[PDB]
Design a protein around this ligand. Sequence first.
Ligand SMILES: Cc1cc2nc3c(=O)[nH]c(=O)nc-3n(C[C@H](O)[C@H](O)[C@H](O)COP(=O)(O)OP(=O)(O)OC[C@H]3O[C@@H](n4cnc5c(N)ncnc54)[C@H](O)[C@@H]3O)c2cc1C
Length: 370
Amino acid sequence: KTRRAEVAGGGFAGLTAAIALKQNGWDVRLHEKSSELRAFGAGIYLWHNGLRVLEGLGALDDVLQGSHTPPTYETWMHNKSVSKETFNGLPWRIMTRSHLHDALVNRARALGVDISVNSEAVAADPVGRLTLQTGEVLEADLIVGADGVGSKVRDSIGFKQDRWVSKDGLIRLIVPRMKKELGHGEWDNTIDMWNFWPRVQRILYSPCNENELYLGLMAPAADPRGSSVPIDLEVWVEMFPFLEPCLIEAAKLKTARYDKYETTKLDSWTRGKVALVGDAAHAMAPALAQGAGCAMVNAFSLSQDLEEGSSVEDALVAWETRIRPITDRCQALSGDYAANRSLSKGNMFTPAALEAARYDPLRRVYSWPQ
Ligand SMILES: Cc1cc2nc3c(=O)[nH]c(=O)nc-3n(C[C@H](O)[C@H](O)[C@H](O)COP(=O)(O)OP(=O)(O)OC[C@H]3O[C@@H](n4cnc5c(N)ncnc54)[C@H](O)[C@@H]3O)c2cc1C
């Protein structure tokens, strides 16, 4: 009677699938390749779609405590404010990655999800097996590929994949807010601080709570000072002097990494009893801040479709058919924004840009109209 799920990946997609399945009475085992459960990338934004998934997972309270909704999302071009957007009340939130990841881990443990670390999936079979790097073959009614970019679960099966890689990247960090030292201004806002002159450098300034500030320092990979890690303090201060107190702190972080990204569009997300979720299926450009939101909605939604009385194989097909278009459209528009630098103009969180954000996975409708 008790159905079994094997999840490869302990990132936001895997943790979400795990919790949602466990809530529905699945016996779920999650496998994380790393030696501990950690999330990288410094900070993250969630919108109403993602926040609803957390509500659905019973992990919302722990996320909202200790994270921040700025009074406004502000854009600057060459230090001039060009927009302030509040999205007609659409909920949104900024936090560190560890904060979101910890809430999800605690919830999974509270539910009794079996979590293994040092446990790497190297292959999956559509008939319902997952092979680990040690050689162990696990049978289950449902295998979830939540193993991120470069997914072995996906590549062991072979999907037709459109791949693209960005040449340019950014350096993401958590630093103290330094609020007093920043002096006059609106330093609780999101501030997307664009510049093309004297050089292409941008900081997305993203308060996570009273103590922690998430910064994303973005410069071309061809720029040997701006792309440097640990950060080349002088070049960031010269273009963002009003952030010097925080940048001095960022310069102390010798763990900084300059990270680029890749995008992935697949011919399908399923094969038999194997479902691909998150980056493994649909890595997208960061411009709409929806990569994880989409992953969380999709993982959540996969549990919904598995409650319909159908075989797993048919429930998977139904799931992709139902939920995929919101992700495809989001991915597409985000890619276009990123290629065209569209957010530089401000006022670009249009109703179509906000489509994925407006989606409520709990009631399966679009809310917070614009
Ligand atoms: C610059 C940038 C900014 C972004 N900002 C946002 C944002 O603000 N808001 C947002 O919603 N999204 C954002 N994203 C997207 C977001 O980072 C990803 O979409 C999301 O983290 C992917 O979740 P995941 O669970 O699919 O994969 P991952 O987070 O990559 O996790 C996969 C996990 O699987 C593990 N793993 C890997 N291989 C194996 C294996 N073989 N076996 C077992 N485990 C394995 C990994 O160790 C990792 O723990 C951003 C992306 C970029 C590039």
